[PDB]
Design a protein around this ligand. Structure first.
Ligand SMILES: *[C@@H]1O[C@H](CO)[C@@H](O[C@@H]2O[C@H](CO)[C@@H](O)[C@H](O)[C@H]2NC(C)=O)[C@H](O)[C@H]1NC(C)=O
Ligand SMILES: *[C@@H]1O[C@H](CO)[C@@H](O)[C@H](O)[C@H]1NC(C)=O
Ligand SMILES: *[C@@H]1O[C@H](CO)[C@@H](O)[C@H](O)[C@H]1NC(C)=O
Ligand SMILES: *[C@@H]1O[C@H](CO)[C@@H](O)[C@H](O)[C@H]1NC(C)=O
Ligand SMILES: *[C@@H]1O[C@H](CO)[C@@H](O)[C@H](O)[C@H]1NC(C)=O
Ligand SMILES: *[C@@H]1O[C@H](CO)[C@@H](O)[C@H](O)[C@H]1NC(C)=O
Ligand SMILES: *[C@@H]1O[C@H](CO)[C@@H](O)[C@H](O)[C@H]1NC(C)=O
Ligand SMILES: *[C@@H]1O[C@H](CO)[C@@H](O)[C@H](O)[C@H]1NC(C)=O
Ligand SMILES: *[C@@H]1O[C@H](CO)[C@@H](O)[C@H](O)[C@H]1NC(C)=O
Ligand SMILES: [Mg+2]
Length: 750
DNA sequence: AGGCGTTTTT
DNA sequence: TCGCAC
């Protein structure tokens, strides 16, 4: 039986997904479809320019409707083609159950009539230039109204959006209003007092006063950022804040006693008026980024009262054309007892010392400090030792060079107690002195430095808690026998992209240190171009995962018997990545020398044109085999062998023309199979013996299926349809004639 | 005439 | 195969 909502796909929770189908009108679906059960209909990025009274009339329990990007205004069209969307008067009134509507990125100039059931309305990036009391008649349950981007450089209109005084007072339930990028010069008058979120960023509102926020005493978030910009930082078209602006009255915010979040970013602020924060006792988030507060933060008392503040953004408060020799934060930061997160990135200052951050040093809840992109060249990392709550320091993208004068394969540090990011700095050697006071660290990132050192066991000595060390993108010379042995808790080591030493033809390297790392569980040697003159064996009783992708095992395994047991000493290994190793051949004997403990083997993007499937019996614990991106021309040469525990097989992006009968029949644990992007002209149940009904995933997209009338694959795919992703749209014909490139459902082949 | 295309946010 | 110790 056919998928029920062709050409669309039924997804969980009553979602009918019609996205990206190039539809010119709303599909009606068959009278046999359960139109009753449809709660959400997605029509994202089709090319529907005309909506009709009958379009949604049969979807009698429809709650969510997404029509975004159907008819973009010329400024937002990728080719600047104009578009105007017509909407018959009852299009949405015919859906009395509708709760959420997205009409954004559509060329409409008025708000259509809407049912009184509506709770959320998105009208962003349309050409609606006015809201008056008749625009939103009857929407007494509306809680969210987003209408951003109706008049700006990507969607110009030649005037300000006009929201008439009191236009929205009839929306007595309205809690969220967003009117960003609308060329406003004043705040709309007499907005609904129920508002909790008012977002007015990236307009040209350059004066504020208490009268502009009259009666908005329920506000929890107010965003007025980006209304008076510093164009020297801008990535986009930008007009400079005029001289002597902005003008924000002392008492602008003083009635907003419930305010939790205030955004004053990119407002050309050189000074902070302490009165702005008076009476904001519930304020937890303050964004002051992209202002000119570099001197103010050394002297201000404006933070004195902010006892509930959790997150403070001061990023990109830099002085044009300069960096500072020194920076000393004001004493008043010490009263921020709730502070959890401070962002000081992009201020530009050259020395980080005891005095810089002293007011923060006893703040008990301070967990995350962002100090990246500051051109810091001298950093006393010892300053952090006695910070009582610190979990994360970002010092990446600086100029520090020393002491002062798949998570399967590599875990992240997100769950760890103390992480320092020193990636993208200027280290060329690692000296232990710089880490002397950092013995509490669990994770250290040193990726993308210039480390060129023959590490030997003396570099990381103080780091006795360190579990994860990221040295990727450096030039470490792997040679000495005791590298990394000074890290007694090391579990994960990333040495990927340290290729330059391995490219020194004629100079060998030594990986014997891996055997000396008794706690190591995850290692990456990926993208190192390892190809000759290296240790003949890697050895570890502890290692679980090894990423060896992006090397030349092809060259190693061609050199007689030298490297045929290279991985065999990894006695507990469960996951191995041998992707992108230029492999044109394997021997069964070579596969049999991989660790018998292996559960996952990746061989992606090699050049294998043959695979001896019987050799899988040599890997009796194997559950996942990834052969995507090779050059197989068939699934033949014996079938999957009896007894295999294989659960997942990926042979996508090969050149597979046919599969032998019964190829998969003996893989009784097989659940996921990817045949995508091969040269298969059919899909046959006989491939599977009598076990095709057991598959949970069968991907057959991007194959040149032969769509002859009565083609047998059609019935088969309908029988297993629950397992086939994208069946309604991405399973396409390669032939005959005009069917080439069309869905197998474009015409009824039965 | 319409088409284009996977498009966050500045 | 990188200051070892003919
Ligand atoms: C089957 O394989 C195809 C092709 O190898 C997968 O499609 C790719 O998926 C990744 C994301 O997982 C994308 O980054 C690629 O750019 C996609 N490429 C193509 C050509 O589609 C597909 O997702 C796999 N199927 C399943 C069910 O995992
Ligand atoms: C913004 O409004 C002014 C008129 O006040 C107009 O000059 C300008 O073109 C408008 N900007 C855009 C992007 O339409
Ligand atoms: C707000 O909506 C609720 C429930 O959707 C409704 O009962 C109430 O009458 C509405 N209130 C106002 C002030 O319109
Ligand atoms: C604020 O509310 C008061 C009392 O309800 C009313 O008199 C006043 O007009 C409102 N202010 C504005 C600017 O709408
Ligand atoms: C926070 O807002 C509440 C209402 O939630 C109000 O009673 C109080 O004045 C505000 N300040 C604090 C510190 O609770
Ligand atoms: C590491 O090399 C240095 C010379 O830079 C040497 O002094 C030190 O003893 C070596 N450490 C080990 C563990 O061999
Ligand atoms: C690798 O280094 C270890 C420890 O120093 C040493 O025993 C072994 O001989 C070295 N390998 C080569 C090929 O010299
Ligand atoms: C492998 O199968 C291919 C494709 O059917 C066939 O040409 C080839 O002779 C087979 N080789 C072996 C060794 O089985
Ligand atoms: C697979 O390898 C085994 C053992 O080397 C060999 O006996 C058999 O002939 C091979 N199969 C194919 C299809 O070449
Ligand atoms: Mg060499």
């Amino acid at each position: 039986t056919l998928p029920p909502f062709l050409p669309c796909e039924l997804q969980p929770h009553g979602l009918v997904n019609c996205n990206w189908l190039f539809l010119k009108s709303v599909p009606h679906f068959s009278a046999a479809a359960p139109r009753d059960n449809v709660t959400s209909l997605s029509l994202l990025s089709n090319r529907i320019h005309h909506l009709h009274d009958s379009d949604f009339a049969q979807l009698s329990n429809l709650q969510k409707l997404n029509l975004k990007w159907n008819c973009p205004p010329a400024g937002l069209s990728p080719m600047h083609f104009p578009c105007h969307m017509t909407i018959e008067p009852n299009t949405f009134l015919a859906v009395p159950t509708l709760e959420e509507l997205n009409l954004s990125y559509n060329g409409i100039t008025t708000v259509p009539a809407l049912p009184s059931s509506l709770v959320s309305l998105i009208l962003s990036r349309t050409n609606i230039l006015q809201l008056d009391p008749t625009s939103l008649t009857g929407l007494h349950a509306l809680r969210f109204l987003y209408m951003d981007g109706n008049c700006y450089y990507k969607n110009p209109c030649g005037r300000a959006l006009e929201v008439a005084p009191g236009a929205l007072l009839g929306l007595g339930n309205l809690t969220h209003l967003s009117l960003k990028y609308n060329n406003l010069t004043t705040v709309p008058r007499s907005l609904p007092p129920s508002l909790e979120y008012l977002l007015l960023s990236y307009n040209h509102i350059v004066t504020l006063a208490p009268e502009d926020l009259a009666n908005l005493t329920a506000l929890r978030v107010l965003d007025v950022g980006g209304n008076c910009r510093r164009c020297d930082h801008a990535r986009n078209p930008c007009v400079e804040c005029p001289h002597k602006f902005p003008q924000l009255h002392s008492d602008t915010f003083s009635h907003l006693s419930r305010l939790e979040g205030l955004v004053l970013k990119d407002s050309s602020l050189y000074q902070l008026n302490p009165r702005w924060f008076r009476g904001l006792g519930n304020l937890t988030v303050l964004d002051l980024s992209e202002n000119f507060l570099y001197d103010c933060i050394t002297k201000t008392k404006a933070f004195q009262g902010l006892a509930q503040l959790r997150r403070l953004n001061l990023s990109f408060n830099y002085h044009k054309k300069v960096s500072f020799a020194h920076l000393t934060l004001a004493p008043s930061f010490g009263s921020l007892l709730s502070l959890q997160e401070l962002d000081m990135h992009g201020i530009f200052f050259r020395s980080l010392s005891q005095k810089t951050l002293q007011p923060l040093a006893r703040l008990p809840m301070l967990q995350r400090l962002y100090l990246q992109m500051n051109f810091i060249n001298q950093a006393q990392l010892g300053i952090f030792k006695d910070f009582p709550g610190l979990r994360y320091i970002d010092l990446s993208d600086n100029r520090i060079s020393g002491a002062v004068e798949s998570e399967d394969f590599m875990p992240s540090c997100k769950n760890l107690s103390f992480t320092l990011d020193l990636s993208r700095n200027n280290l060329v050697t690692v000296q232990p002195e710089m880490f002397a006071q950092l013995s509490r660290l669990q994770c250290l990132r040193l990726s993308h430095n210039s480390i060129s050192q023959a590490v030997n066991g003396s570099q990381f000595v103080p780091l006795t808690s360190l579990q994860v060390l990221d040295l990727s993108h450096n030039k470490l010379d792997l040679y000495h026998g005791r590298s990394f042995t000074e890290l007694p808790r090391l579990e994960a080591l990333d040495l990927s992209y340290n290729s330059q030493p391995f490219s020194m033809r004629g100079v060998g390297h030594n990986l014997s240190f891996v055997a000396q790392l008794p706690t190591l569980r995850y290692l990456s040697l990926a993208h190192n171009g390892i190809h000759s003159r290296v240790s003949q064996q890697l050895c570890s009783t502890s290692l679980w995962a090894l990423d060896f992708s992006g090397n030349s095992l092809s060259q190693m395994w061609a050199e007689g018997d030298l490297y045929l047991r290279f991985f065999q000493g990894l006695r507990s290994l469960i996951r191995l990545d041998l992707s992108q190793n230029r492999l044109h051949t394997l021997l069964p004997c070579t596969l049999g020398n991989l660790p018998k403990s292996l559960q996952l083997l990746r061989l992606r993007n090699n050049y294998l044109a043959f695979f001896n499937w019987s050799s899988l019996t040599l890997l009796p614990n194997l559950e996942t085999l990834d052969l995507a991106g090779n050059q197989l021309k068939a699934l033949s040469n014996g079938s999957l062998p009896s007894g295999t525990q294989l659960q997942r097989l990926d042979v996508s992006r090969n050149s597979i023309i046919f599969v032998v009968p019964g190829f998969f029949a003996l893989a009784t644990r097989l659940r996921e199979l990817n045949l995508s992007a091969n040269a298969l002209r059919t899909v046959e149940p006989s491939w599977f013996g009598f076990l095709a009904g057991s598959l949970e995933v069968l991907d057959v997209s991007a194959n040149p299926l032969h769509c002859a009338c009565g083609a047998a694959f059609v019935d088969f795919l309908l029988q297993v349809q629950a397992a086939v992703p994208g069946l309604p749209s991405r399973v396409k014909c390669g032939s005959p004639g005009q069917l080439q490139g069309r869905s197998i459902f474009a015409q009824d082949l039965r």
